[PDB]
Amino acid sequence: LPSGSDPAFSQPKSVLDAGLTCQGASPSSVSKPILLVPGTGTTGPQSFDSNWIPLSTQLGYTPCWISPPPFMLNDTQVNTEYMVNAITALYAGSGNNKLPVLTWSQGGLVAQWGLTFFPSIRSKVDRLMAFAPDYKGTVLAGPLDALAVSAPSVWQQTTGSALTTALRNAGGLTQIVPTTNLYSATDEIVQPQVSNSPLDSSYLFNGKNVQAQAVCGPLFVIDHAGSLTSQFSYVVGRSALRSTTGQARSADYGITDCNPLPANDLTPEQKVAAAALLAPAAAAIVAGPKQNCEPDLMPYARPFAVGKRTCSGIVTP
Amino acid sequence: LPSGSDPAFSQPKSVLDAGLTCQGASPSSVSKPILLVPGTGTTGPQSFDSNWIPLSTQLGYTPCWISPPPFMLNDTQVNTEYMVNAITALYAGSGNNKLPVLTWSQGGLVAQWGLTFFPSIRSKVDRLMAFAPDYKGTVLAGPLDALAVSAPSVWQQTTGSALTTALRNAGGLTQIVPTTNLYSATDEIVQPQVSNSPLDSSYLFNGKNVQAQAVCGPLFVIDHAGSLTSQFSYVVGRSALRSTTGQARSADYGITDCNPLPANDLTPEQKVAAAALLAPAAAAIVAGPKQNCEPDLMPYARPFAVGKRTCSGIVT
Ligand SMILES: *[C@@H]1O[C@H](CO)[C@@H](O[C@@H]2O[C@H](CO)[C@@H](O)[C@H](O)[C@H]2NC(C)=O)[C@H](O)[C@H]1NC(C)=O
Ligand SMILES: *[C@@H]1O[C@H](CO)[C@@H](O[C@@H]2O[C@H](CO)[C@@H](O)[C@H](O)[C@H]2NC(C)=O)[C@H](O)[C@H]1NC(C)=O
Ligand SMILES: [Xe]
Ligand SMILES: [Xe]
Ligand SMILES: [Xe]
Ligand SMILES: [Xe]
Ligand SMILES: [Xe]
Ligand SMILES: [Xe]
């Protein structure tokens, strides 16, 4: 696990600040911030408007989010600069108090990538609550890569990629702060997830790894979006947020919570938007950047993926 | 469309017979057979054990398959001989009743090649259910081979080949029996497939052409193998086999069936094997025989590709 200096940002602070927003507040002065990190092909509001923005508010946080241009389709390493900058600002802006980080899809990857390579945030992040995170990426991105219709971060989120290799070799498949991972074997975007074991993309060693089917039964179905927005998700996320261990507790949820539909506390109109979460992401990925190779690893990550091939060639020792 | 007698087999009949196997039945006596034609780099069981062998069985058919050696990598015209022979056999052993044929990848091209050039089997094939068929071949060279160092059948499935030229010119890009073509814009082996229109390699004129994304939206992702194994592929497949017209019906599938993962009815172990269908197939292509030219068309196909080049040279 790297433990020296933070790598320098490739983006100016003014650029990284322009991608952070809080609801009803400036980040330099905010009460109880929760930082929300969005999925692939979405902004913060598109990922979280219909769910964790109002649900975290009702739990007493001030929701904050990053929206890395364009819609999280660019380099994951740069997306992480937005998060590291945001954590740093929210920590100070909230009286030097640690803050929770809550994520979906790529956002979990971005968060764990942050914790792995930017040691400074380790003492500023209270816990991690990750919904459907792809630490090992997904095999399903593969045919998109072969067709050269994959955005930079879609390449990076493909199993076997230089980036996911780098994360693994640096020790990032072990939790770095108290982490809860909620995911589903029936996730139609992120696979493999079927094992309820270290083989799963969403699994971290020593983490609170919650496969929906382990709680709700092997026949239970919940998809990629519902991993974030469901009633079941809410009860788990609330468990993780309220817990004094920093992880969700088994005693906090059970069979009566196993409802994959949008969380009960959402208004009917929010439920409609939540169910259709992936629609804006579909249009963004279709109109988004596409290339025929994986983006190069930043210098700090290269020693951990020697032999992998990116846009510029083989990563050398 | 070619009209006369069937062209003579280049292979002994007994060799072709041994390439046919039915699950639990002699070909001489089988109820409700369905013939499975496999993709490049596979045997019948390798293409279908994790999917349409058990899925057709639960639908009430007896699955039968052909396995032309070596792993469908040889001449597509010889691959076709196995299928023609198999159909003739299964038709008689089911009481002279027509039988459905269901195919993956090269399987569809083989099927349509047979229907185009072997007229005897037209009265014997009830319907064709082709998943990701490459009737136009593919424009994708791919990463498996050095360019123009490839298996016989890989040459033949390259867009612009003498064999795809011959198929088009013979009239074989029109459906010959009631045909359903299920395919995907996100097929990484066969392209073009993205337009939902006669531009796609899987499209047959008058056929029931089902491009998955046309029903499931642009980010519904199933690959060349997902085209065969997914829940949506199952639903469309089931419709085509049940339909009283021999083609899948739009009424039997819609948005709610849009699940890219392997068909629900498959066991957990089948789902794993089906999701992994491609890797060994690609490996047999990499590891297979290789040559620097497209095999020659048989005499029966040469008039339909005059000017194309093959191993012996230009077609006269
Ligand atoms: C998208 O990611 C690329 C690649 O990481 C970024 O390009 C780098 O940008 C920094 C600052 O402009 C430069 O100093 C680097 O030299 C660039 N590297 C390459 C390989 O291009 C780009 O800034 C990102 N774009 C957005 C909008 O975030
Ligand atoms: C692979 O295909 C080739 C070419 O179609 C087959 O070779 C022909 O076989 C017939 C019958 O033995 C001969 O009359 C021809 O002279 C052969 N032509 C050539 C170019 O070799 C071959 O039999 C096939 N191999 C297998 C194992 O199916
Ligand atoms: Xe996505
Ligand atoms: Xe984080
Ligand atoms: Xe994607
Ligand atoms: Xe999506
Ligand atoms: Xe056929
Ligand atoms: Xe060719």
Numbering used by the authors:
A (entry chain A): 1 to 317
B (entry chain B): 1 to 316
Structure paper excerpt:
Lipases (EC 3.1.1.3) are ubiquitous hydrolases for the carboxyl ester bond of water-insoluble substrates such as triacylglycerols, phospholipids, and other insoluble substrates, acting in aqueous as well as in low-water media. Among lipases, Candida antarctica lipase B (CALB) is the one that found the widest application in many industrial processes because of its high enantioselectivity, wide range of substrates, thermal stability, and stability in organic solvents. CALB belongs to the α/β hydrolase fold family with a conserved catalytic triad consisting of Ser, His, and Asp/Glu within an acyl binding pocket and a binding pocket for the moiety of secondary alcohols. CALB has two α-helixes surrounding the active site, namely α5 and α10 (14, 15), which have been shown to be very flexible regions and could work as a lipase lid by a relative motion between them either by increasing the working temperature or by working in organic solvents.
Pressurizing the crystal with xenon probed the tightness of the closed lipase conformation. Three xenon atoms, with anomalous signal bigger than 4σ, were located in monomer A in the catalytic site in close proximity to the catalytic triad. In particular, the three xenon atoms (8.3σ, 6.3σ, and 6σ map level, respectively, refined with fractional occupancies) in monomer A are located above His224, in the hydrophobic region of the catalytic site defined by Leu144, Val154, Ile189, Leu219, Val221, Ala281, Ala282, Ile285, and Leu287. No xenon atoms were observed in the active site of monomer B, thus confirming that the conformational rearrangement of the residue range 140–147 prevents the access of any substrate to the active site. Xenon is also found in the hydrophobic cavity defined by Met83, Val101, Leu115, Ile121, Val125, Val37, and Ile187 in both monomer A (10.2σ) and monomer B (10.5σ). A further site is found next to Trp155 in monomer B (7.2σ). The location of three xenon atoms in monomer A, in close proximity to the catalytic triad, and none in monomer B, confirms that the conformational rearrangement of α-helix 5 seals the active site. The unfolding of α-helix 5 results in the closing of the lid over the cavity, preventing the access of any substrate to the catalytic site, as shown by probing binding sites with xenon. Probing the crystals using xenon validated the open and closed conformations.
